[PDB]
Design a protein around this ligand. Sequence first.
Ligand SMILES: *[C@@H]1O[C@H](CO)[C@@H](O)[C@H](O)[C@H]1NC(C)=O
Ligand SMILES: *[C@@H]1O[C@H](CO)[C@@H](O)[C@H](O)[C@H]1NC(C)=O
Ligand SMILES: *[C@@H]1O[C@H](CO)[C@@H](O)[C@H](O)[C@H]1NC(C)=O
Ligand SMILES: *[C@@H]1O[C@H](CO)[C@@H](O)[C@H](O)[C@H]1NC(C)=O
Ligand SMILES: *[C@@H]1O[C@H](CO)[C@@H](O)[C@H](O)[C@H]1NC(C)=O
Lengths: 98, 50, 164, 43
Amino acid sequence: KRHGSWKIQLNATSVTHKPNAIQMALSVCEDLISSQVYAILVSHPPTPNDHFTPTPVSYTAGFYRIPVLGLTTRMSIYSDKSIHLSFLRTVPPYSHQS
Amino acid sequence: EKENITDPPRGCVGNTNIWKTGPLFKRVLMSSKYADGVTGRVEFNEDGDR
Amino acid sequence: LNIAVLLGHSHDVTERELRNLWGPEQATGLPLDVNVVALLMNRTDPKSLITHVCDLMSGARIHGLVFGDDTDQEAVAQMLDFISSQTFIPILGISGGASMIMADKDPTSTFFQFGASIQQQATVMLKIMQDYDWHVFSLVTTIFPGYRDFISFIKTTVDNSFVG
Amino acid sequence: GILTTAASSMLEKFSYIPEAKASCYGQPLHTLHQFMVNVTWDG
Ligand SMILES: *[C@@H]1O[C@H](CO)[C@@H](O)[C@H](O)[C@H]1NC(C)=O
Ligand SMILES: *[C@@H]1O[C@H](CO)[C@@H](O)[C@H](O)[C@H]1NC(C)=O
Ligand SMILES: *[C@@H]1O[C@H](CO)[C@@H](O)[C@H](O)[C@H]1NC(C)=O
Ligand SMILES: *[C@@H]1O[C@H](CO)[C@@H](O)[C@H](O)[C@H]1NC(C)=O
Ligand SMILES: *[C@@H]1O[C@H](CO)[C@@H](O)[C@H](O)[C@H]1NC(C)=O
């Protein structure tokens, strides 16, 4: 809306819950490599897998070094940018509570 | 606002190389200062957090 | 047992000598059904990685996985770690990006690399510095991650050092 | 050699250690994770 009269536009792409994490990785990898997305966000708290693992999205996009924005997850194991090569988040993990 | 802007391709067909300005785009995201926000003012620290 | 050795490489080595590398070996064979699956891959994009891993796991339930590499893409091994988070299969990484050091493993994972950690490599480097009596040094790092563990390990090693 | 060493050292203890997954589509206790802490292969 307010971003100039330049010819750039933005398309939306969204994929949802799957209980199987390998097929989550399959949906993410095919549907985001085939689409050429430039920025990927993750917004999945309410999983029955209570380990809170957005790891396949982060690893798949950090293969080709595409940034992944975590939105609800707050584990400090994702703070290691050497493991998760292109993962950022705008929520504080619990260690910063210290 | 800059040149040398490449595209992450359809990497499933014959593309094993990385995207060239990956760390450059990530550094732009790290150096992204903001003064507007619904939940509050957002800024990335050295750990890339709020 | 059923072990798949896949090689995503550019170093031209064929696959039948990998079969002969097991064939006359295993003198004391305690398992009764051990098979080798020697495969050569040319492109290491993660779609083909997960596809071949699912095909080999559906390929008569392969229980062992060994992967080598000659490139500098470490996250593939981390991809194997995610495979190690899900397939419940012990996975070995040989060289290249398959064995570059990741920081912390998982109890949900059974992944392993064939290499030396940055702490053990720092131990070797401090042994080198001790063997020439180069007792004065300065530590210089960038903001590349892993630096805090590096500094803390060096300080705890100097605190446990007879050198002074 | 490490894999066969761990498999042969655990096979003497418990036999049904190979317990794989069938396929990725449509989704064990005694494992080799904590057993192969040591290994020996030709010294
Ligand atoms: C935008 O994305 C949707 C969902 O994949 C797709 O159906 C549509 O064709 C895309 N439009 C553009 C801009 O190509
Ligand atoms: C793009 O990269 C080339 C490499 O030679 C460099 O000369 C040029 O200054 C870069 N573009 C910019 C930042 O204007
Ligand atoms: C916190 O909330 C207030 C509104 O109550 C607003 O100024 C902004 O979102 C935040 N400011 C701080 C950090 O106090
Ligand atoms: C090289 O990789 C391609 C892509 O999978 C494959 O079709 C071909 O069989 C491979 N060749 C060798 C030597 O394995
Ligand atoms: C290896 O571990 C097993 C099981 O604890 C033990 O029986 C064996 O003596 C060990 N061998 C060596 C040389 O450490």
